[PDB]
């Protein structure tokens, strides 16, 4: 019968939610008033990319902090070099729409998706002049929002079908599905050990899944609105979500519960991207008001604006390294700031 | 590091040449989106003319880019935004489709489109598909009561033997989109209503785009 | 997670009045929109009518105009629909949904199926 089964979670919800308010005890703003504020940081752009042609969605830094790849709208997946500012790939999509792109630790393979519901996966190796897909990991519902490599043969996926995959690349066959979404999922982070990943769904709820095993760890909720961004807190035991609500929350692994909100009355507009620094100290948040914005943590004050682009930051990444950040635009710009 | 620095600079050169003949080539096409509802019968349309059935056509040399929903999920909340940029948004609606009240979502919809801040700069272009079945079916005042006491325009044309019911059905249908776009301030962004079933939709749409990019250019240059 | 449970319901004759309370929590009531949705037996999700965030503009679908009317206590954080008279196309389970975003006037998958932002419904018979 429905009805028991209603009531019972009912009832076991009410209980984790007097459990988790009766267990909350510093609260962070109490215990956090000590440490001194940042300050202001007024960082400066130092190199501009003006290759592509339409708005830029997705990239993804690399390892060794020097290569970036970039997805656009128009078909385009070009690597770039923040050094020398000259491009090195450019790989024409066989689909124009594309919403992510994965660069793999390893450097040797990069993946894309978007609304053609397929994933394809490139190798940088030439063999004969020229780069072509090497293998295409069909089978998804949905169009995939983000893509993310575990290593040189897992890699992770997910779509708006409501559910993520793994896959293989040398069989193209689902290894591990996570099941239980009811809204569609629009970002994917992995932690640093790769072991768990938190995937943010449109009902305003974070769960953290065993990328191994499949199972839901914990489920957070809080936003009044569709989470779009996901990152990883450095130390590996927390996590920080965006919405549309103009506001940034930071929850807590082994808490369960919500940690600490970044709102203001001035901005209203919704929050696509959001990232650590190495230190964790700093979030940069993108924002729809065509600025970015630099979220100081544990206090909540303001500390930089990043108004250097003239549309809706899309997207936004930082090196492995913590040396430069590099934010992208709809204005087909791409700026690195240090 | 002066030998691979100019093999990089040859490979830099080498990729500008081939983004610069690929620009050219996008910007010749024309970006259209297709959205309707399931009932609308869209494949019927797309006939007279995978995540996305891409379609390839080209009228009087103007290379056109126009993409399907197919197989998506019926939440157009997030992926919607995609098509912001397109030229325009092609819109068909079953005037026909009964079971259940396909007209008040179909206008819900349109007003959701119409009114959204990344979409205000996109022109809808509106089609009303099976009309035969809705001059069957006639041959309405139940959703819409207003119908009853409407009175056909008096600049309506309508063709040589047409029944007079369906005219004024059909144009009381128009008229309600046209007031629900029209209801808030549209900037960068019309509608153009028109009658299709007919193989003369590549020429509207054809029509429409250069109105679209002319009434464009004219608003750059602040003419209108 | 936000909540929208509704109060009220039953078996009435035709021709009743039938106040339709739902009570939502969790979030600022405000700034989003609320509308209602209705689900015909064996049919599919209908939009009914719904609030602007002030209430300044209210709108109706065609079939309830006149015949039903809502009201917004921002005080109380709960919206009412008071139906004055029922019709036998009425018997169905209403659902008192939200809108998507805030602090926008359009709103994007209202009737759509497996909605997040829906309440659990009440059965009303004629």
């Known amino acids: 019968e429905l009805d028991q089964l209603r009531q019972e979670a009912e009832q076991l919800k009410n209980q984790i939610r007097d459990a988790r308010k009766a267990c909350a005890d510093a609260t962070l703003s109490q215990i956090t008033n000590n440490i001194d504020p940042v300050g202001r940081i007024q960082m400066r752009t130092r190199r501009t990319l003006r290759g592509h042609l339409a708005k830029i969605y997705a990239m993804h830094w690399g390892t060794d902090s020097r290569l970036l790849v970039s997805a656009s709208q128009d078909g385009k997946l070009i690597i770039w070099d923040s050094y020398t500012t000259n491009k090195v790939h450019a790989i024409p999509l066989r689909s124009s729409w594309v919403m992510t792109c994965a660069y793999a630790p390893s450097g040797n393979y990069v993946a894309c998706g978007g609304l053609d519901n397929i994933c394809s996966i490139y190798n940088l190796k030439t063999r004969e002049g020229n780069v072509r897909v090497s293998r295409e990991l069909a089978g998804h519902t949905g169009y995939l929002s983000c893509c993310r490599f575990l290593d040189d043969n897992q890699i992770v996926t997910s779509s708006g079908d409501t559910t993520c995959a793994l896959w293989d690349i040398e069989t193209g066959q689902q290894t591990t599905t996570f099941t239980g979404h009811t809204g569609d999922v629009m970002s994917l982070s992995l932690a640093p050990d790769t072991r768990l990943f938190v995937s943010g769904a449109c009902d305003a709820s974070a769960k953290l899944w065993d990328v191994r095993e499949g199972m839901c760890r914990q489920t957070f909720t809080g936003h009044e609105s569709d989470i779009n961004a996901i990152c990883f807190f450095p130390n590996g035991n927390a996590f920080a979500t965006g919405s549309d609500d103009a506001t940034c929350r930071l929850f807590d692994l082994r808490a369960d519960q919500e940690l600490m909100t970044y709102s203001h009355d001035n901005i209203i507009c919704g929050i696509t991207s959001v990232s650590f620094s190495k230190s964790g100290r700093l979030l940069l948040a993108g924002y729809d008001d065509f600025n970015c914005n630099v979220w100081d943590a544990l206090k909540a004050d303001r500390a930089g604006v990043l108004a250097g682009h003239d549309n809706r930051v899309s997207c936004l990444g930082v090196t492995d390294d913590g040396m430069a950040v590099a934010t992208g635009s709809w204005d087909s710009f791409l700026k690195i700031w240090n | 590091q002066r030998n691979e620095e100019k093999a990089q600079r040859e490979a830099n050169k080498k990729i500008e040449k081939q983004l610069q003949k690929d620009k050219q080539v996008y910007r010749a096409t024309h970006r259209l989106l297709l959205l309707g509802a399931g009932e609308s019968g869209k494949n019927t349309i797309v006939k007279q003319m995978s995540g996305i059935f891409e379609t390839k056509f080209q009228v009087d040399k103007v290379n056109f880019h126009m993409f399907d929903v197919g197989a998506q999920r019926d939440e157009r909340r997030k992926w919607i935004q995609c098509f912001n940029d397109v030229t325009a948004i092609i819109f068909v609606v079953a005037s026909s489709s009964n079971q259940t009240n396909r007209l008040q979502a179909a206008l819900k919809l349109f007003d959701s489109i119409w009114n959204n801040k990344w979409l205000r700069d996109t022109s809808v272009i509106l089609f009303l598909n099976k009309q035969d079945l809705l001059a069957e079916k006639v041959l309405i005042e139940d959703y819409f009561p207003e119908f009853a006491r409407y009175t056909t325009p008096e600049d309506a044309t309508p063709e040589p033997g047409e029944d007079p019911r369906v005219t004024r059905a059909k144009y009381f249908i128009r008229d309600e989109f046209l007031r629900i776009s029209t209801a808030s301030g549209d900037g960068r962004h019309y509608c153009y209503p028109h009658f299709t079933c007919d193989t003369e939709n590549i020429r509207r749409v054809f029509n429409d785009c250069r109105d679209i990019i002319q009434r464009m250019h004219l608003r750059q240059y602040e003419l209108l | 997670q936000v909540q929208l449970q509704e109060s009220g319901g039953g078996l009435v004759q035709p021709g009743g009045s039938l106040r339709l309370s739902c009570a939502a929590s969790?979030?600022?009531?405000?700034?989003?929109?609320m509308n209602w949705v209705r689900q015909a037996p064996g049919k599919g999700l209908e939009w009914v009518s719904d609030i602007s965030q002030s209430g300044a503009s209210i709108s109706y679908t065609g079939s309830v105009k006149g015949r039903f009317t809502i009201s917004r206590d921002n005080a109380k954080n709960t919206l009412y629909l008071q139906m004055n008279s029922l019709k036998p196309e009425d018997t169905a389970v209403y659902y008192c949904?939200?809108?998507?975003?805030?602090?926008?006037?359009?709103?994007?998958?209202?009737?759509?199926?497996?909605?997040?932002?829906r309440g659990q419904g009440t059965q009303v018979t004629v």
């Open positions: 969790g979030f600022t009531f405000s700034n989003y929109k």
């Open positions: 949904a939200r809108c998507p975003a805030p602090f926008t006037r359009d709103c994007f998958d209202v009737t759509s199926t497996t909605y997040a932002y």
